[PDB]
Enzyme design. Structure first.
Site, short mmCIF file in Angstrom:
data_model
loop_
_atom_site.label_atom_id
_atom_site.label_comp_id
_atom_site.label_asym_id
_atom_site.label_seq_id
_atom_site.Cartn_x
_atom_site.Cartn_y
_atom_site.Cartn_z
N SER A 176 0.78 -1.24 0.00
CA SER A 176 0.00 0.00 0.00
C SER A 176 0.80 1.28 0.00
O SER A 176 0.23 2.36 -0.11
CB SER A 176 -1.02 0.02 1.14
OG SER A 176 -1.90 -1.07 1.03
N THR A 177 2.12 1.19 0.12
CA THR A 177 2.95 2.37 -0.13
C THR A 177 2.71 2.83 -1.59
O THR A 177 2.83 4.00 -1.89
CB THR A 177 4.45 2.11 0.12
OG1 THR A 177 4.90 1.01 -0.68
CG2 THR A 177 4.72 1.83 1.62
#
Ligand SMILES: *C(=O)[C@@H](NC(=O)Cc1ccccc1)[C@@H]1N[C@@H](C(=O)O)C(C)(C)S1
Length: 442
Positions: A176-177
C-alpha cells in the site's frame, strides 16, 4: 598490493574502512571498526574473494592506481616515501546509519530482516543504507585462507543471506505504499481529494472469480462511499482498486515511469536493481497493481526516492553515496555534483500528496512519534510468495520530515514482518522510520 597502505572509506569524519601495517606476508590488514552496521556501504576487501561495494567500486582510488592519482604514486616511488591510497568520503551520516541499524536489531521482538534507506530530498545524498542481517567484513579481511573460506561458506549457506544488500539489490512488493503512485496517477488525470469511492468491505476483480477485500473485512467507513482523502489516510483497499481501474493501465504505467520504475537505475556508484510496475496484462492485474501487489516490485531505495521526490516538490534528485574523492594528501580529486534527474509530478500534485501523507501519518499507529515534528508518511503491508495467505507479509514505511520543509526521507522494509502473519507497516516499520527521522533531525 598489500605492501602499500590502501586508502580510507569515511562517513562524517569517521573511518568505516582503513588499513593497518602488520607483520603479515601481505603487510596491510584491512580493518572495519563498525563492521555489520557499514557492510552495505564498505563491502569487503578479501585476499581470496576480491572486493564488493565501495571497496570494489572505488578500488583504483583506494589503492592509488587511479589516473588522477598516479602522478603522486610516481613521486612517492622516486622520492622514497611509503605509498598511500586515496580517500572516499561517503554521504552517510553515522548517527542516522547507527539509529537505523539499532532500531532494526531491536524492533521485531529481536532482530528484523530487511532494509532502511535515508535520503536528503533536496540533494540526493544517501544518508543511511542499512541491510539486516549483516555480516562482519573483518572475517573476509583475514589473512588466513581457512578463516576466509569458512566465513565465505557459512555466509553463503545462511538462508537469511546476510551478504545481500537488501536496500539496493533486492525488490519486493511495495503493497500500500504504492497507493502514493495510484493517487498521483489519479490526480494528474484530474481526480480530486474529494472524489467518492467505494467503502465496500470487498470488491470483485473484472474477468476473474477472485475478490479483493479491505484489511479485516471492514467497510472503509459507515457511509456507502468515502472521499479519496479518507480512503488514503485509512488505507482502504477496495477504494484504490476501484480508483486504479477507473484511472487505467496506461496512466499508472506512465506515473510509475515518472517515479523511476521500469527505468535502469544510475549507479550510486553501487548498482541498483531495477524496480518495476509489471506488465499489467489485464484488469484483474490492474486492480492488484493499484494496491502494490501483482507484479509491482521495488527496492527500498526506490521507495525512499518516491518519498524524497514528493518531499522535493516533485523533482527527483539523482541519488549518490560518494560526496568526494581525495588524494592521500586529501587534496580534492573529485567532488560529486548534485543533479535533477527528472520531474515526476507538478509542485501542486506533490503538495497534495504531502497533505494526504501528513493525514495518513496521523491515522497510523503512533509509536516513536517526535513531539513538534510533523511527519508525512505512508504505511504498507505486502503479501508475497507462492503461499501468500499463509506467509507473513512485509511491513513497509515510507516517510519524510518536517513535512513543510523536508530534511530527510526514509524507507523502512521489515521483510517477512518479524515472522508474524498479522505484521503491519504501522506496527513494525513506522517506529523504525520514526527513530531514523528523529536521528536525522537531532
Ligand atoms: C496495503 O498495504 C494494504 N495491505 C493489506 O491489504 C495486506 C494484504 C492482504 C491481502 C492481499 C493483499 C494485501 C492496506 N494497507 C496496510 C497499511 O497501510 O499498512 C493495511 C494493513 C492498513 S491494509
Amino acid at each position: 598490493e598489500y605492501s602499500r597502505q590502501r586508502g580510507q572509506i569515511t562517513a562524517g569524519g569517521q573511518l568505516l574502512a582503513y588499513s593497518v601495517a602488520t607483520d603479515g606476508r601481505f603487510r596491510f590488514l584491512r580493518v572495519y571498526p563498525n563492521p555489520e552496521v557499514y557492510a552495505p556501504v564498505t563491502g569487503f576487501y578479501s585476499l581470496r574473494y576480491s572486493s564488493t561495494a565501495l571497496e570494489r567500486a572505488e578500488d583504483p582510488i583506494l589503492n592509488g592506481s587511479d589516473r588522477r592519482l598516479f602522478g603522486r604514486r610516481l613521486a612517492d616511488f622516486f622520492t622514497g616515501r611509503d605509498p598511500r591510497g586515496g580517500n572516499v568520503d561517503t554521504t552517510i551520516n553515522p548517527r542516522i546509519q547507527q539509529a537505523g541499524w539499532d532500531a532494526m536489531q531491536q524492533g521485531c521482538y529481536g532482530p528484523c530482516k530487511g532494509a532502511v534507506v535515508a535520503l536528503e530530498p533536496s540533494t540526493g545524498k544517501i544518508l543511511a543504507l542499512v541491510s539486516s542481517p549483516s555480516y562482519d567484513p573483518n572475517l573476509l579481511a583475514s589473512h588466513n585462507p581457512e578463516v576466509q573460506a569458512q566465513a565465505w561458506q557459512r555466509l553463503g549457506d545462511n538462508p537469511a543471506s546476510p551478504l545481500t544488500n537488501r536496500a539496493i539489490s533486492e525488490t519486493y512488493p511495495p503493497g500500500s505504499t504504492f497507493k502514493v503512485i495510484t493517487t498521483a496517477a489519479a490526480l494528474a488525470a484530474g481526480a480530486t481529494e474529494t472524489e467518492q469511492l467505494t467503502a465496500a468491505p470487498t470488491i470483485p476483480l473484472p474477468g476473474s472469480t477472485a475478490q479483493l477485500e479491505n484489511y479485516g473485512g471492514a467497510p472503509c467507513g459507515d457511509e456507502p462511499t468515502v472521499s479519496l482523502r479518507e480512503a488514503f489516510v485509512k488505507s482502504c483497499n477496495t477504494a484504490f482498486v476501484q480508483l486504479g481501474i477507473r484511472t487505467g493501465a496506461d496512466a499508472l504505467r506512465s506515473m510509475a515511469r515518472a517515479f523511476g520504475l521500469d527505468s535502469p537505475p544510475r549507479p550510486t556508484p553501487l548498482q541498483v536493481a531495477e524496480s518495476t510496475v509489471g506488465p499489467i496484462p489485464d484488469s484483474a492485474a490492474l486492480g492488484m497493481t493499484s494496491i502494490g501487489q501483482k507484479d509491482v516490485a521495488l527496492t527500498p531505495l526506490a521507495n525512499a526516492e518516491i518519498a524524497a521526490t514528493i518531499a522535493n516538490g516533485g523533482i527527483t534528485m539523482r541519488p549518490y553515496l560518494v560526496g568526494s574523492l581525495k588524494g592521500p594528501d586529501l587534496a580534492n580529486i573529485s567532488t560529486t555534483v548534485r543533479y535533477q534527474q527528472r520531474r515526476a509530478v507538478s509542485p501542486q500534485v506533490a503538495a497534495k500528496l504531502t497533505e494526504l501523507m501528513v493525514g495518513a501519518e496521523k491515522v497510523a499507529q503512533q509509536k516513536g512519534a517526535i513531539p513538534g515534528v510533523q511527519i508525512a508518511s505512508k504505511t504498507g503491508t505486502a503479501e508475497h510468495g507462492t503461499d501468500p495467505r499463509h506467509t507473513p507479509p512485509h511491513a513497509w514505511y515510507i516517510a519524510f520530515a518536517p513535512a513543510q520543509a523536508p530534511k530527510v526521507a526514509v524507507a523502512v522494509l521489515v521483510e517477512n514482518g518479524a515472522d508474524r502473519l498479522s505484521a503491519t507497516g504501522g506496527a513494525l516499520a513506522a517506529p523504525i522510520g520514526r527513530a531514523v527521522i528523529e536521528a536525522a533531525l537531532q
